[PDB]
Design a binder for this molecule. Sequence first.
Ligand code: 23E
Ligand code: 8XM
Length: 550
Amino acid sequence: SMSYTWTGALITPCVYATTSRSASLRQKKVTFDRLQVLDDHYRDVLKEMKAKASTVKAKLLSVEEACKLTPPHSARSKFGYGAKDVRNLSSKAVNHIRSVWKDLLEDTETPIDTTIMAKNEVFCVQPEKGGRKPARLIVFPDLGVRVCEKMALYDVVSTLPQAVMGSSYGFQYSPGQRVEFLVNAWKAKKCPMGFAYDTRCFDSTVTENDIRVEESIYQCCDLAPEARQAIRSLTERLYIGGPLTNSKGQNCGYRRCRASGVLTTSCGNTLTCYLKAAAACRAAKLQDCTMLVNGDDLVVICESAGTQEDEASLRAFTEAMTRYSAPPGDPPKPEYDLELITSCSSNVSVAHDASGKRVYYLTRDPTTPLARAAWETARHTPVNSWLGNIIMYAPTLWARMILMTHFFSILLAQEQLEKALDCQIYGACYSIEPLDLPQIIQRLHGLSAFSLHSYSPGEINRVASCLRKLGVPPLRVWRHRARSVRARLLSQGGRAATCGKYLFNWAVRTKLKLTPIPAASQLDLSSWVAGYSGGDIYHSLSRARPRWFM
Ligand SMILES: O=C(O)/C=C/c1ccc(NC(=O)C2(NC(=O)c3ccc4c(C5CCCCC5)c5n(c4c3)CC(=O)Nc3ccccc3-5)CCCC2)cc1
Ligand SMILES: CNC(=O)c1c(-c2ccc(F)cc2)oc2ccc(-c3cccc(C(=O)NC(C)(C)C(=O)Nc4nncs4)c3)cc12
């Protein structure tokens, strides 16, 4: 069937940023009929997956438990109540949720309406690479449905993917753990080879059968009968597809593929992609495959059988994936250095800590993080990629020298260090206090993140070239600026001084010996686990039992 059908009704809205005018170009790309042929390899992997799912027990979340997970800036309900009312357990919201739930338990076929919108993403615009890129589409049900999804499937999506995929489940890793997995995977092979597999419009390639296969995996859990019916009804009425409505309330068409704004988007895409990829590994007869699946993103580390054999295996892998209804965007390239694989726009690099020891870390081209940050300083935005980039890429030269320096000088100038901000980062929305960045960074990357030096020439040159291209002052200017920022932060004591000490040690002539932050142990990061991209999940950072002297 067709991934989408359109009535022709325009997608209405509620460093450059893509608008809902360029959404028409995206519609042509994402619209196509799907051809899917399955085999024994696919059925075998599926059964092995289902067998692992069988070990899972999932709790049914209460109205309140589910309400408390709602982001405060989550799109308001067309039934006149919003994220705040939900979070506050307002009788109108709670009563409207209890009815949506009842309807899911009682109505098994009626499609649920979804809202289609364009996601305004800030970019740079490379004139050498060609032209502009279209805006991505966000398909999501009403607030009431969204709370019900959490009641039925939050515990499923939090525990099932790791039970099924184990170490292959990307979303379970902090950036430091992800790198540890990749490096060990690489080191474990006699002669390693690796590649990234990028599917052309993954959500669109997802068939209504793919969606039932994943409900079949969810159905292996020990579920409460209401959770079972909710999963069943949500599959038929929402996940397999339904009608598309713009912000103006007009019908835009109909969908028969993955909805990007549902709780099961990351989880379902991970399971689906893993299933197809593990099946394709067998079809292409790759030896000793290690997979890292992160939503629609895939990295395979296998055993090299020689340049010509490896190229042959990859073509076979692609042919299998295509049959499974997962054709590639760009055909995969085999790589013989781990640092050469690019996935989730990232690559593994190496540096030294304070004692000369090697430390691996994730990095990426800084152009987009810098442009988005340049836009975010220019105009107030409710979701800051800059803070997600600091947290995600804390060990990188560019996050430390440019992002940290620039934004702490602004927070200093606005006496807003204490003010919690909402940060994006791939999936879920996080409420983070900039003053907590050192503990966060220590927890996610290690104390070494504050002592990294001896960066590779390639990384240094990438960062420097990028600054020149974007009209950003050079690294020597940033070192100067970070010395004032540091000085002013130190003079403020407490967490602010820790920000100056730890985050800006790189800027001082004679380096300070940095001890582990004591308060880093008391931060609760238990929730940080799974990917909830479109999942509408809110996690505000908390600390159990704070020691007074902190
Ligand atoms: O050779 C030497 O010895 C010294 C050279 C040198 C060169 C330029 C300056 N510039 C400045 O001081 C000013 N801008 C900046 O000091 C500035 C800071 C951050 C900037 C950023 C981003 C960086 C990431 C965080 C958000 C801010 C961008 N641009 C920046 C400019 C350049 C700009 O204007 N816009 C963009 C556009 C896209 C990408 C980045 C930028 C402030 C007053 C005059 C302009 C200072 C020193
Ligand atoms: C298959 N591809 C991959 O696995 C990735 C590769 C890659 C690159 C090159 C390779 F040769 C291989 C793999 O680079 C990546 C960069 C980022 C992400 C990512 C995506 C989603 C969440 C988080 C995350 O870390 N988010 C934060 C809140 C910062 C976090 O800390 N999350 C946590 N989640 N649980 C505990 S902590 C990170 C994933 C990949």
